[PDB]
Amino acid sequence: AMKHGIYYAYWEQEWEADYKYYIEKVAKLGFDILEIAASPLPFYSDIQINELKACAHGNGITLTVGHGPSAEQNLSSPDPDIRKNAKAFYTDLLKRLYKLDVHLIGGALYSYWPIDYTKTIDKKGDWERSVESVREVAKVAEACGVDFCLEVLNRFENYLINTAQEGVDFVKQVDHNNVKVMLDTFHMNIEEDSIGGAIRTAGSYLGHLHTGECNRKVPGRGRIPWVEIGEALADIGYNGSVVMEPFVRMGGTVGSNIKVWRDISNGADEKMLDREAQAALDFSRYVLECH
Amino acid sequence: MKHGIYYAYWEQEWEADYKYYIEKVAKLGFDILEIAASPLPFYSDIQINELKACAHGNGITLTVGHGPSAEQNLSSPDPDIRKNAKAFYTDLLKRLYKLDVHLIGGALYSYWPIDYTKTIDKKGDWERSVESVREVAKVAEACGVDFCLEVLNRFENYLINTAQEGVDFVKQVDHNNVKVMLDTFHMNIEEDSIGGAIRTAGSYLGHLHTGECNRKVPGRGRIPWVEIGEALADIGYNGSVVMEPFVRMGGTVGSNIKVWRDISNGADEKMLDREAQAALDFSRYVLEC
Amino acid sequence: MKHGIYYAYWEQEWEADYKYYIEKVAKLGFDILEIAASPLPFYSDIQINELKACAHGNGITLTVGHGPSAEQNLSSPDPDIRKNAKAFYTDLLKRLYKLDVHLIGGALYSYWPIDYTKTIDKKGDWERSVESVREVAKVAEACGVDFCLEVLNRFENYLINTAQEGVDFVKQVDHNNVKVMLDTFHMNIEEDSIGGAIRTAGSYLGHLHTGECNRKVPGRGRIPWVEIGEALADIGYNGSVVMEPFVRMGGTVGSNIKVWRDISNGADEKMLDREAQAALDFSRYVLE
Amino acid sequence: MKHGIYYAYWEQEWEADYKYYIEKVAKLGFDILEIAASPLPFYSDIQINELKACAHGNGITLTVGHGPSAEQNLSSPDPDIRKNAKAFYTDLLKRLYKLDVHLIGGALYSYWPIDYTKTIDKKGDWERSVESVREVAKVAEACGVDFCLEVLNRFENYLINTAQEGVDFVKQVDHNNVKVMLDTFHMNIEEDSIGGAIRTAGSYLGHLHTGECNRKVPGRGRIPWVEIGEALADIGYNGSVVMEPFVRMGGTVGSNIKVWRDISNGADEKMLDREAQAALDFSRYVLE
Numbered sequence A: 001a002m003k004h005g006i007y008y009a010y011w012e013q014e015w016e017a018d019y020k021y022y023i024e025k026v027a028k029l030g031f032d033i034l035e036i037a038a039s040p041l042p043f044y045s046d047i048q049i050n051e052l053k054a055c056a057h058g059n060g061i062t063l064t065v066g067h068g069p070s071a072e073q074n075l076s077s078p079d080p081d082i083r084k085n086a087k088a089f090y091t092d093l094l095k096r097l098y099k100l101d102v103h104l105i106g107g108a109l110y111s112y113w114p115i116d117y118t119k120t121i122d123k124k125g126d127w128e129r130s131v132e133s134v135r136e137v138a139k140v141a142e143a144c145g146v147d148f149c150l151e152v153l154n155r156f157e158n159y160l161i162n163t164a165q166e167g168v169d170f171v172k173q174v175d176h177n178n179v180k181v182m183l184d185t186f187h188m189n190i191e192e193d194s195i196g197g198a199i200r201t202a203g204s205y206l207g208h209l210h211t212g213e214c215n216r217k218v219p220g221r222g223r224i225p226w227v228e229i230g231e232a233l234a235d236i237g238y239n240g241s242v243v244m245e246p247f248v249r250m251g252g253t254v255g256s257n258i259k260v261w262r263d264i265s266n267g268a269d270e271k272m273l274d275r276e277a278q279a280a281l282d283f284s285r286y287v288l289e290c291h
Numbered sequence B: 001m002k003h004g005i006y007y008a009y010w011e012q013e014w015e016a017d018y019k020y021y022i023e024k025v026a027k028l029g030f031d032i033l034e035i036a037a038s039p040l041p042f043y044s045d046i047q048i049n050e051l052k053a054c055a056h057g058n059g060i061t062l063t064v065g066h067g068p069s070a071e072q073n074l075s076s077p078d079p080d081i082r083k084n085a086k087a088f089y090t091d092l093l094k095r096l097y098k099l100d101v102h103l104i105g106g107a108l109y110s111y112w113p114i115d116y117t118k119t120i121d122k123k124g125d126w127e128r129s130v131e132s133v134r135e136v137a138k139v140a141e142a143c144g145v146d147f148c149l150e151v152l153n154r155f156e157n158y159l160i161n162t163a164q165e166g167v168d169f170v171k172q173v174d175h176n177n178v179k180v181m182l183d184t185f186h187m188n189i190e191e192d193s194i195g196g197a198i199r200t201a202g203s204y205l206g207h208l209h210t211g212e213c214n215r216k217v218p219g220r221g222r223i224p225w226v227e228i229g230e231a232l233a234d235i236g237y238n239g240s241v242v243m244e245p246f247v248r249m250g251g252t253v254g255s256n257i258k259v260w261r262d263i264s265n266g267a268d269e270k271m272l273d274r275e276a277q278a279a280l281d282f283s284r285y286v287l288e289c
Numbered sequence C, D: 001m002k003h004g005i006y007y008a009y010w011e012q013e014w015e016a017d018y019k020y021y022i023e024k025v026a027k028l029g030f031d032i033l034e035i036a037a038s039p040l041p042f043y044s045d046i047q048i049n050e051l052k053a054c055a056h057g058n059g060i061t062l063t064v065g066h067g068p069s070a071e072q073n074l075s076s077p078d079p080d081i082r083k084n085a086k087a088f089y090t091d092l093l094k095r096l097y098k099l100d101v102h103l104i105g106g107a108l109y110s111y112w113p114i115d116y117t118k119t120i121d122k123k124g125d126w127e128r129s130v131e132s133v134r135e136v137a138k139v140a141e142a143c144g145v146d147f148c149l150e151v152l153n154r155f156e157n158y159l160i161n162t163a164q165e166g167v168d169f170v171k172q173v174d175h176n177n178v179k180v181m182l183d184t185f186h187m188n189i190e191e192d193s194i195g196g197a198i199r200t201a202g203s204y205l206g207h208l209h210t211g212e213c214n215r216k217v218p219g220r221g222r223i224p225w226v227e228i229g230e231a232l233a234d235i236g237y238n239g240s241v242v243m244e245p246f247v248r249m250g251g252t253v254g255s256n257i258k259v260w261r262d263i264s265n266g267a268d269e270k271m272l273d274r275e276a277q278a279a280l281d282f283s284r285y286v287l288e
């Protein structure tokens, strides 16, 4: 019923990589999707884009995209020039997604990430500016055939949208068909009173789901209430994609942004990493589907 | 075991009239009032004694919590900061002794909240902290105080994130007045198993903070209280249990804890009093035996 | 939401001085005392009034539970037994009206405990029950009583084991005074989902029994109380919630409930009172 | 850690063509096939060597389960029944030695299913059973067989309902080849804590049965599999894990297990295989 994927970053420490290599890999592991980071895409020549797309197609894999925007790409910024640069970044990015045959982008698209908490916070303001900026970027995504998914994050990674109710509120205000709410088991695990409740609250608006255990290991052997999640996705008729985003390695920008300060992977080599991702894929298909 | 509640549940700054809160929590039924250490250094020996008297008078025991500033960072590579940090704790510990306060907990091995803007040297900071803490432990052992190292989630600290890392750090310190401190809010993020984490701390568990996943008072959230209660019994925990709910926006507290929505849902002091009391009955009931 | 407790939590027989428990329960803070129906047929109109006055006085609502005997089996193939069964409930409902009791619950569509040696004809008994209950239901309407059919685990009943079955049975009866009743001890065994079972019962839910997996008072076991509070809220449940803990060996109750070890761990009456009161505070707090 | 499944998952009677299930199970990927012991006493020496050969040929290990009949009740007050009982198990154990199986489990210290009409004499039945099992243990040791006592829920047994009661019994038996056996379906009913029950069994746990709350295959139900995996690692479990799902109505199995609704949802043999295999993968992954 649902399509299952994994973020390429599970194997890499930077926000870019040889996506073709991961497409070939997740396809043999049996995944339906490979989620990739948007950051290197604006530096892809036309033929590079075509090759990536031809790779996904040839391997029967669908590409989705995640993005943690930089401060210069902050659609909610009070500075009108940053907003302008941001809109131009997204417009160019969305057109590149069109050339890639990609139809979903997700992450803290209504803000930037990681948040510099060193600075003063104007939530009400940022919220207002964000809703307006997202409104117009949404027109471009729609024209590009891309769903713009706004991911609800925990309090330490953002201050605008921390619960599914805030995400639904923000999205209703945006009021554009191709703009959705996106939940993540790791972020819900912290902020939500109820996991099934948060999903039922998102309901018809839910456009993407990220998965990971409480401490971001692969889905299945931790404390996340997977069965409850499966019932709730069934209650809301969720048709979509489910992308596991495990982060178990220290090091690099990835290690530092996700804040992995111990070797959660326990010395796993690449092959070990593959086997767990595959077991977690099988587990996700078995537990999360068909009610 | 004894149950308490951190005073900040009612305030938006890391200070307040602790005497007012002692009488409040005593009315509510608590055995403990946990107070922020921050204003304690600016106390006169007169203020210390009355607070101590106010507590004893109401039958309330006092515990202290502390989010060290950058300049109180015992892990700092800067020797002047380490110096000033030990000086701060030595005085504080002495003052705590003049209040018959026998327990202090928090990111005592580091600083909070930490600035992730700068570069982090985990292995270095860890070695410096072990040493500094063992030293402060001496002053602690003298003032009759258990120096409790709270295990925090990755967003708030990078040295100790799991009970296992906590036990290892404390064992490296190798001193009787240094303990591991667990918090249900942080365990909920970092641990594979809640009961397993508590069993791991075992004899080193010197203090426990409670709160729901999103920091509401214990009870109607997703925290596995029964499992916790059972594990505390597995390790024969005798220590205290202090709820540390944070449900209000605003101020340094709302900012440090990162409450960006009104979780209390417009609760007034009376409403907050009731929920705390309900959470108290709930905790004594579920967590014991 | 009104909270009660079943008097047998203290007693080892399906009968006791309900006046004594009405008072004990009133000081513990419950809103309801649930009693067994079996002694009621032996009460004079005077005793009935003495009971209804002791309750109205202590500000306690009374609910009734009943585990039918074989002779009271509304689903029996034996047309005589069905006739006797219908008269029994007809008389009982009339008595309940006098006591101003508006709810009766239990395996009212069958009997309890079930004798499993007797061969089982589920399809047969199911059709007979539906017919029999629809009749009794008119009587129930007249007396102003909600006839609640408790869904039980497979070891205590074979007709209705899950909320879905209960709902099908009730819909087939098709009569407003017939409700589905759930019990956490029973759901714990048979259901795929607790919150889901509740949501399935939805509008048909007329009564809820509570207890831990092993029948201890609500709160320190594995039943998912928060999930229940949430689902009751989702279906807009305002009915009552009655705990029915059984922690003592011995007697017809100990034998019928199958308590084969001292689950109360030597609790004396004041100890049992204390735990029921704590469980009551827990239930008001968590479930609402 | 070795995983198996009970052949009765596909059948409605306490016997069947075990060679057929050995091949099916090898193909699905299981390490073990657990079979009912009842047909085994009537196996010629030839049939025994054929079954053993099939098992070795397919890389499958065999374990055995058994619901004793009243005449095989080692706890019986009637000394003749105890005599028959002992002789039944001594012959059975030697056959297991021939078939090359090192494990037998079930309510071996009693009989199953239990006739509850008979008044219960727990204490008496308990002492006798301890004594009888101890004698049998010697034969079990001689045959290199682990005699595992399954802890059951109150509706199916009155002697051992919790892990603590099972350990007490086994410690009282005081013999190395007698072990405690837990079952997720039974634990779900009686225990305060699943993980706690497993850690209480600890070194004494010699076998584990799995099933969801309502006996569906492991995985999409409410059993806390992760907590079980963690407790098994806590104690360092070196035994096997056999799922024992019962999702079909009919026959002695359907009535003994009390399946009164089609839990399988019309699953044909093929769908049952797929689900069994999917649960095997889940079990290997989660229980670690």
Ligand SMILES: O=C(CO)[C@@H](O)[C@@H](O)[C@H](O)CO
Residues within 6 Å of the ligand: A066, A067, A068, A106, A107, A108, A151, A153, A157, A184, A187, A210, A245
């Ligand atoms: O849930 C998270 C943020 O922690 C994900 O969105 C990130 O892993 C992505 O890289 C941000 O798009």
Ligand SMILES: O=C(CO)[C@@H](O)[C@@H](O)[C@H](O)CO
Residues within 6 Å of the ligand: B065, B066, B067, B068, B105, B106, B107, B112, B150, B152, B156, B183, B209, B244
């Ligand atoms: O649990 C926490 C961290 O979130 C405690 O450290 C703080 O709440 C104290 O106020 C300072 O340690």
Ligand SMILES: O=C(CO)[C@@H](O)[C@@H](O)[C@H](O)CO
Residues within 6 Å of the ligand: C065, C066, C067, C068, C105, C106, C107, C112, C150, C152, C156, C183, C186, C209, C244
């Ligand atoms: O759930 C149950 C016990 O199985 C209770 O409703 C019964 O014991 C009633 O007392 C009679 O049906």
Ligand SMILES: O=C(CO)[C@@H](O)[C@@H](O)[C@H](O)CO
Residues within 6 Å of the ligand: D065, D066, D067, D105, D106, D107, D112, D150, D156, D183, D186, D209, D244
């Ligand atoms: O758990 C159980 C009985 O409920 C199993 O051991 C039985 O089904 C076996 O067939 C006989 O012990």
Ligand SMILES: [Mn+2]
Residues within 6 Å of the ligand: A151, A184, A210, A245
């Ligand atoms: Mn995410």
Ligand SMILES: [Mn+2]
Residues within 6 Å of the ligand: B150, B183, B209, B244
């Ligand atoms: Mn804390």
Ligand SMILES: [Mn+2]
Residues within 6 Å of the ligand: C150, C183, C209, C244
């Ligand atoms: Mn009941």
Ligand SMILES: [Mn+2]
Residues within 6 Å of the ligand: D150, D183, D209, D244
């Ligand atoms: Mn079993």
